[PDB]
Amino acid sequence: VPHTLSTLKTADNRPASVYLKKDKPTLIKFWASWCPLCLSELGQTEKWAQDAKFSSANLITVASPGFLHEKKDGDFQKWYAGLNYPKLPVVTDNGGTIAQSLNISVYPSWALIGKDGDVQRIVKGSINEAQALALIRDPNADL
Numbered sequence: 272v273p274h275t276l277s278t279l280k281t282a283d284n285r286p287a288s289v290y291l292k293k294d295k296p297t298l299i300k301f302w303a304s305w306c307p308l309c310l311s312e313l314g315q316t317e318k319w320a321q322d323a324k325f326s327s328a329n330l331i332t333v334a335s336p337g338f339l340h341e342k343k344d345g346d347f348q349k350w351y352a353g354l355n356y357p358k359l360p361v362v363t364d365n366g367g368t369i370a371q372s373l374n375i376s377v378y379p380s381w382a383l384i385g386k387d388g389d390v391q392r393i394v395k396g397s398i399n400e401a402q403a404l405a406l407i408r409d410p411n412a413d414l
């Protein structure tokens with residue numbers, strides 16, 4: 272995942288690596304434009320990404336154009352450009368390479384990648400602040 276991720280860019284054409292520090296675990300939120308749950312959480316997730324509470328980990332989100340009912344590549348970025356979450360990292364994975372690799376099937380879903388690149392936990396559905404903090408405290412913890 273860490274490699275495929277480093278080869279991707281954000282919805283606004285910046286290297287995903289810009290949001291990934293080498294010695295930190297990575298918390299990834301998978302979502303899609305058609306999901307009301309996901310749309311209603313964009314502001315919250317942006318807040319989390321900038322919150323000191325999660326400073327010990329990288330926090331990004333992944334949208335997958337042309338995968339799981341998401342808008343095709345190009346169309347997605349144009350749609351998302353209409354929203355405003357400047358501090359929310361939105362990596363676009365055309366075809367959902369990472370999602371398939373992790374067998375993501377519902378949105379939202381969260382994955383915690385160890386600092387070394389190994390997938391440590393995959394959580395289906397939305398998580399709240401308490402569950403997110405638990406996930407960072409211990410990948411195997413009961414959120």
Ligand SMILES: [Cl-]
Nearest residue numbers: 396397398402
């Ligand atoms: Cl729950």
Ligand SMILES: [Cl-]
Nearest residue numbers: 315398399400
């Ligand atoms: Cl909540």
